[PDB]
Design a protein around this ligand. Structure first.
Ligand SMILES: [Cl-]
Ligand code: NA
Ligand code: NA
Length: 292
């Protein structure tokens, strides 16, 4: 009946294997099955009640490797299971879900900054390439509004971006939309009450605490209340009508702070601390694990 906020992977000195689940009601963190491979710069999503960890990079004392992996966590069994991998490794990936399919957007493989996009079908455990973005984007934020896929911000290998673009699955075509007010790579991007929010990020000079929101009906981005803590490479998700931002990097520290945005009051508040500070996590919401 209850849903938890799951955080997978991340980075603190090296890539991490943690899977932990926060209960916003009773405040606990549950420690769950480790990822099979430590990964940072991954994305999380949920389809059919299953949690997916997509892409990322294994930064380890023995060597560093970007990841094409897709892995699936079942809260009913507390077990991870591999899926078919993507066509390429994608570190600092963004993902979105449309009609039960996972879209993997952008990211990097070594020096390659991807504009490519591919789509995963769980019923067939297959990936297929779709039309590439107009822009190469690593650290891209992704959100889905009315079955359209939005790619927001990022880094093209030279410039950090305020541009955003929109994918029409029926046309297999990307179209530029109105750009954000602020350049952001590594922002948290999500959908809440039919608006896209973009929180935090890095603009090549500062880590950011500002937050802006896109209204499709007016095709306008509008600033809302800023976060308390500047942060890049944060995790973000929506739980029961509020945004939660997890961790990140502020230029000095890997944060354990979790903040929560209430849209009704336009206020942020700090609600918990992760068990250790980290950046580059994947985060999503699904049912609590079965203990019995
Ligand atoms: Cl441990
Ligand atoms: Na960044
Ligand atoms: Na707006």
């Amino acid at each position: 009946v209850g849903r938890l906020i799951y955080t997978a992977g991340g980075y603190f000195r090296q890539s991490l294997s943690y899977l932990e689940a926060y209960n916003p009601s009773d405040g606990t963190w549950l420690r769950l099955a480790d990822l099979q491979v430590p990964r940072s710069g991954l994305a999380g999503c949920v389809v059919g009640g299953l949690l997916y960890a997509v892409g990322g990079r294994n930064n380890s004392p023995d060597g560093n490797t970007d990841s094409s992996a897709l892995d699936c966590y079942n809260p009913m069994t507390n077990q991870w299971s591999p899926c078919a991998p993507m066509s390429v490794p994608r570190n600092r990936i963004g993902v979105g879900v449309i009609d039960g399919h996972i879209y993997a957007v952008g990211g990097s493989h070594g020096c390659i900054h991807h504009n490519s996009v591919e789509r995963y079908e769980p019923e067939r455990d297959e990936w297929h390439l779709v039309a590439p973005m107009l822009t190469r984007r690593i650290g891209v934020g992704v959100a889905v509004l009315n079955r359209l896929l939005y790619a927001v911000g990022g880094f093209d290998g030279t410039n950090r971006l305020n541009s955003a673009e929109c994918y029409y699955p029926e046309r297999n075509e990307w179209r530029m939309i109105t750009a954000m007010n602020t350049i952001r790579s590594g922002a948290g991007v999500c959908v809440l009450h039919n608006c896209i929010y973009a929180a935090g990020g890095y603009d090549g000079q500062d880590q950011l605490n500002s937050v802006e929101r896109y209204d499709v009906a007016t095709a306008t981005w509008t600033f809302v209340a800023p976060m308390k803590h500047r942060r890049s490479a944060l995790g973000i998700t929506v739980h029961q009508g509020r945004i939660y931002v997890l961790g990140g990097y502020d230029g000095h520290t890997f944060l354990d702070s979790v903040e929560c945005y209430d849209p009704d009051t336009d206020t942020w508040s700090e609600v918990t601390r992760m068990t250790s500070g980290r950046s580059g996590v994947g985060v999503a919401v699904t049912m609590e694990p079965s203990r019995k």
